[PDB]
Curated annotation (Swiss-Prot), chains A, B:
Name of the featured protein: General control transcription factor GCN4
Disruption phenotype: Abolishes recruitment of the mediator complex to the upstream activating sequence (UAS) of amino-acid starvation responsive genes. Decreases RNA level of genes involved in amino acid biosynthesis and cofactor biosynthesis during amino acid starvation or methyl methanesulfonate stress. Growth dependent on amino acid supplementation. Sensitive to amino acid starvation. Sensitive to purine starvation. Decreases cellular glycogen levels during glucose starvation.
Induction (record text): Translation is induced by amino acid or purine starvation, or during growth in low or poor carbon sources. Translational repression during nutrient-rich conditions is dependent on four uORFs (upstream open reading frames) present in the 5'-UTR of the mRNA; these promote ribosome dissociation. Translational induction occurs in conditions reducing translation machinery efficiency, leading to ribosomes scanning over the uORFs, and increased translation of the mRNA. The rapid translational induction is followed by transcriptional induction at later time-points, independently of the uORF sequences.
Span within the parent record: 249 to 279 of 281
Location in or out of the cell: Nucleus
Species of provenance: Saccharomyces cerevisiae (strain ATCC 204508 / S288c) (Baker's yeast)
Region span, Leucine-zipper: 5-26
PTM per Swiss-Prot/TrEMBL: Phosphorylated by the cyclin-CDK PCL5-PHO85.
Family the entry assigns: Belongs to the bZIP family. GCN4 subfamily.
Amino acid sequence: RMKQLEDKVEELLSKNYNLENEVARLKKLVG
Amino acid sequence: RMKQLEDKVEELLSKNYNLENEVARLKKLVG
């Protein structure tokens, strides 16, 4: 369960980097 | 450290929900 929690942190960080990359692409379209 | 890992999961999920809400607002502007 240490490892499962660590795995979930790594997974959520990857998801937020994808969301960050998407926000930047959309902001480039608006801006 | 169990608690610290759990805290980090909860924090990253809140960040991704904010990013999700931002993506939806920007997509509403484009769409």
